[PDB]
């Protein structure tokens, strides 16, 4: 005798009738839902390759709140009545890229590209909280995202255009 876990991913309702307490969101996304845009880099919260946006009603603030999180650490069992947005939630070369995706691509902010969905989701999240951030706000958004390829310069530069 056990409850159903109900949550949303890129706007679609997920009802999981047999949630295992030990299931992380990254494992569910990739291996149950088939959305492999979100990556495993470390499994320990350091690199942000598994970065998603989460949205929930904060029954206190009023407010739907939007924030980022590491999917490799997020138990799906915390996520009852929570909304997840992944890289595929924001746009695609099949329909239209999100402006975040287009800019990091055209600015040479992407090499191997493994770190890129994470950074796109940290940048996407900032924009949902602050559609006119400062340059300082843009840099600190990525405190939790690592890139081994680019030396970071081109990423910040492409995104400065979102500032003011």
């Amino acid at each position: 005798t056990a409850d159903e876990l109900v949550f949303f991913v890129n706007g679609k309702k997920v009802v999981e009738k047999n949630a295992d307490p030990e299931t992380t969101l990254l494992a569910y996304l990739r291996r149950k839902l088939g959305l492999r845009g979100t990556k495993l880099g470390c499994g320990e919260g350091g690199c942000g390759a598994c970065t998603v946006m989460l949205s929930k009603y904060d029954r206190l603030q009023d407010k739907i709140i939007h924030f980022s999180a590491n999917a490799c650490l997020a138990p799906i069992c915390t996520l009852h009545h929570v909304a997840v947005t992944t890289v595929e939630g924001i746009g695609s070369t099949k329909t239209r890229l999100h402006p975040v995706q287009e800019r990091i691509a055209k600015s040479h902010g992407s090499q191997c590209g493994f770190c890129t969905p994470g950074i796109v989701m940290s940048m996407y999240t900032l924009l949902r909280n602050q559609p006119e951030p400062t340059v300082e706000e843009i840099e600190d958004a990525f405190q939790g995202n690592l890139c081994r390829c680019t030396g970071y310069r081109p990423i910040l530069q492409g995104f400065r255009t979102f500032a003011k």
């Binding site: 005798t1 056990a2 409850d3 876990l5 949630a19 295992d20 307490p21 030990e22 299931t23 992380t24 499994g43 320990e44 919260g45 942000g48 970065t51 029954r59 206190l60 924030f67 980022s68 999180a69 590491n70 490799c72 650490l73 997020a74 138990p75 069992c77 915390t78 009852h80 940290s122 999240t125 600190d140 958004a141 990525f142 405190q143 939790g144 995202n145």
Partner: protein, 305 residues
């Protein structure tokens, strides 16, 4: 919000809707583990291969998520995310007099280069405090400031200032097996009261040997004569520790060069490390403890001077 129960191959998970439910559940299963952000328990289960057959998530409980302004300080529920703690403190700092926000500003300095946004958005206050890592960056600050801890079990409630006895041994706190941290009030600083917090920018072993501190002086009114002095350090032992021998010696002494020499002599001895202490970096760690105090000394003189 009704309580939810999930059951896996090895684990039972209970999503508590209500404070009363949590305290009943913890009374029935005092060995049950709470999980809020999982930024610590997910590491233990994955990497240290701990299994916790019964998990209670108390994240929905208002209280535990409340932010309360009082006459002594700003109180945060234990499930509050470090991002919210951070947002509320920054707001307090921009709005109040410098002299009331000395402690808020060392909390903020420790949060500065702490993880990243993803971690801070889900890591709770309480999880940090009760994890009691030797290298927690917040525990030294809560200790040096006497941050008050409201602690509850089914039919008990107590509020205790954090002090050196809160951490008896490696990764243990002075909570009985049925108590939960409810709330944490971070104090305004008073007249004649100055606070600094510092950290080593190298971690190299999973939970030891990264120097981190909260430092607090209160002077006699209008003076440079010490009434209270607290210097607390992470990364110098298997727990957060306070240099109490050293600071007791400075009571009623004056903030000067001899005070500087006496504290540093006091520290070199009281926090001294075996040539074989876990973590290595024996001389660097000794030098940081003294060097972080020098910085505090010079800062305090500037807030005076």
């Amino acid at each position: 919000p009704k309580q939810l129960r999930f059951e896996g191959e090895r684990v039972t998970w209970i999503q508590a809707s209500t404070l009363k439910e949590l305290l009943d559940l913890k009374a029935q299963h005092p060995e049950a583990k709470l999980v809020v952000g999982n930024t610590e328990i997910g590491i233990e289960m994955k990497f240290k291969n701990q299994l916790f057959p019964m998990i209670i998530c108390p994240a929905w409980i208002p209280e535990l998520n409340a932010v309360e302004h009082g006459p002594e300080g700003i109180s945060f529920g234990a499930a509050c995310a470090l991002s919210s703690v951070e947002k509320t403190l920054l707001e307090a700092v921009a709005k109040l007099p410098t002299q009331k926000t000395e402690v808020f500003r060392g909390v903020l300095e420790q949060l500065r280069w702490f993880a990243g946004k993803q971690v801070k958005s889900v890591a709770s206050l309480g999880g940090n405090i009760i994890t009691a890592s030797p290298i927690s960056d917040l525990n030294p600050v809560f200790m040096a400031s006497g941050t008050k801890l409201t602690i509850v079990s089914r039919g008990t409630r107590r509020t205790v200032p954090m002090d050196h006895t809160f951490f008896p041994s490696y990764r243990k706190t002075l909570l009985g097996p049925e108590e939960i941290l409810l709330s944490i009030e971070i104090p305004y600083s008073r007249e004649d009261e100055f606070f600094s917090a510092f950290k080593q920018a190298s971690r190299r072993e999973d939970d030891i040997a990264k120097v981190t501190c909260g430092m607090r002086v209160l002077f006699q009114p209008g003076s440079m004569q010490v009434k209270e002095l607290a210097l607390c350090y992470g990364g110098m032992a298997d727990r957060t520790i306070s240099a109490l021998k050293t600071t007791q010696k400075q009571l009623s002494k004056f903030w000067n060069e001899k005070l500087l020499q006496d504290v540093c002599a006091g520290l070199a001895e009281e926090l001294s490390l075996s040539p074989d202490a876990p973590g290595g970096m024996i001389e660097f760690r000794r030098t940081l403890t003294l060097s972080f105090f020098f910085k505090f000394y010079l800062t305090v003189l500037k807030k005076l001077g």
